Design a protein around this ligand. Structure first.
Ligand SMILES: [Zn+2]
Ligand SMILES: [Zn+2]
Ligand SMILES: [Zn+2]
Lengths: 90, 105, 90, 90, 90, 90, 90
DNA sequence: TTCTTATAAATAGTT
DNA sequence: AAACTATTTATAAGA
DNA sequence: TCTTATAAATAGTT
DNA sequence: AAACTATTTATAAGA
DNA sequence: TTCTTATAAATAGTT
DNA sequence: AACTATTTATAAGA
């Protein structure tokens, strides 16, 4: 961007909205590419600050989510805290 | 004089009590008869011996209601998560059912 | 990258697997950034080609999906084809 | 009191209730004083006629119940019938 | 009593025990009377300073203990501090 | 078998022990086959004449019992009485 | 039967229910004969693929479950995986 | 004891 | 559920 | 231990 | 709902 | 909401 | 993995 931004909440309401929409599309585009490049299945669920829902899936959403509930082995599970630590080492 | 049903629930409740104590006990010289054996079982965090399945049994009974986001009871937090997962699964199967009832008509 | 690629399945196993790990991290990174910058909750579920689970959620995964199951209003739901179309338009 | 009463269920609803609250405090007072005077641990559990719970403890209730559960020696245990006979012999 | 006693730990072990025994018996008599007069279920557990157990239950102890572990709503829970406050107000 | 036997208590101790070990194994085999064939969760608890415990569970005994205790809806329950009558109908 | 079947999940729902009803009675009948012939207490709990409950017990179910819970001794415990090995090693 | 066999009992397939 | 059978499986005895 | 003078709890009522 | 007080009850100190 | 583009961020192919 | 040359994303202002 014209300027680097830090990853902390955007306080200007207008700006935050413009950013959500633009970065949300960019996220879905990356997810689409990952699903095609590497033959995988992806479901993405996003609730904005007003609790409106936005969603993407490379196949039927409900099937991916059921497959998640049926999974029973340890596996990579990241959260906002986890990813913070990870970047701090790198 | 209590029904075998109540009496089994009481027995499970007491085992639970015993497990939640041994989970938070830092007193190496504890005088509670079951503490030592129980702390030994808990220390089966070695992953893998005395089956961990027995322990997860008790935790399950416990997990039904341990509310603190930070229980020290082996597996509690994990079991609470799997119970939410299961609840999600029912919801998904229901919605899926409805879409097909609608589709088949 | 050193070279532009087409979004088509990567057939070489080593390349596919290296690309997966890398881009999966990149997608989680962007999801993290979107949830912090714009104050939203996000769930991301990925199954790789061998049906192994990788996941990320801003807050508790199950709570977001639960909230998802309660939604009952029309909303943006995108698939691979919708994204291809949006890409072509530009 | 103004009059001596018999230890028998109080029939009048209003009397029973008022007496219940008064004597209950009196019992907790006595348990409080005993715990301090004699340095002991006391748990008191009371269900009323309409099955509401009232509890008193001079220390953590759950620790007292667990020590009780594992107490593995003969000890004094009284019931109502026991106490009746104990006073009958005076 | 032949004199008022303050509510403070009795230092003399013999006197501590003598006081314990009288007041223990007095507490169980009061509890007995409460349960009869007001038709309620009461359990009383007492460990003395040398950790000997003394117990009273109007009806069976295990029964009252089961119901107690099952109770899952608001109920008054009192401690020594709680009783001291109530005493002071007067 | 070489001959048909009547369904009534085996009075010869040795003969009763032999039969028990054999049929116990058959009963467990049948339980195993039903849970695999029909995708179900089964628990079998057996106390023999000398009061020893033998158990089968398709995966975990305590998971079934837990699910048993929480189940609250009319269900087929059969006793020796119920089963005799169904066998006589035939 | 007309044809030997392999012990693997029956995938067709109608056929699975046919075999289930049939084999469940067979199982409950074997359990009954075992209990009478050899004088044991038996409890059997079955959840089918759609989580409906069926149960048998030679006596009161609750009595059997209590006796199980309070048994504190090593004892034979078989699982589907166990019984697989024993059968394979032949 | 463990290990056959002859048979009784169960069940798959099909109505 | 309830009929058939034809086969297979379990198991009382015999080895 | 069993008493006794004296403190404390409390039934009826206000 | 808490307050009064005439009684009844509990119990401290001492045999 | 778009667009423009300077600049930051991601990542394909190389070591 | 670790490193870069290059492609892709996007922040700010119009
Ligand atoms: Zn301890
Ligand atoms: Zn283990
Ligand atoms: Zn817990």
């Amino acid at each position: 961007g014209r300027k680097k931004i830090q990853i902390t909440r955007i306080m200007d309401e207008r700006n935050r909205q413009v950013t959500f929409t633009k970065r949300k599309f960019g996220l879905m585009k990356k997810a689409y590419e990952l699903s095609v490049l590497c033959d995988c299945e992806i479901a993405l669920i996003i609730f904005n600050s007003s609790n409106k829902l936005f969603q993407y899936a490379s196949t039927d959403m409900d099937k991916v989510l059921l497959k998640y509930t049926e999974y029973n082995e340890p596996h990579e599970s990241r959260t906002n805290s986890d990813i913070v630590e990870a970047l701090n080492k790198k | 004089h209590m029904s075998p049903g109540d009496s089994r629930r009481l027995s499970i409740q007491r085992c639970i009590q015993s497990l939640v104590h041994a989970c938070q006990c830092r007193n190496a010289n504890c005088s509670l008869p079951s503490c030592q054996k129980m702390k030994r079982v808990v220390q089966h965090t070695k992953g893998c011996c005395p089956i961990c399945k027995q322990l997860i049994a008790l935790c399950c009974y416990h997990a039904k209601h341990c509310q603190e986001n930070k229980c020290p009871v082996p597996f509690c937090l994990n079991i609470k998560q799997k119970l939410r997962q299961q609840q999600l699964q029912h919801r998904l199967q229901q919605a899926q059912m409805l879409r097909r009832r609608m589709a088949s008509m």
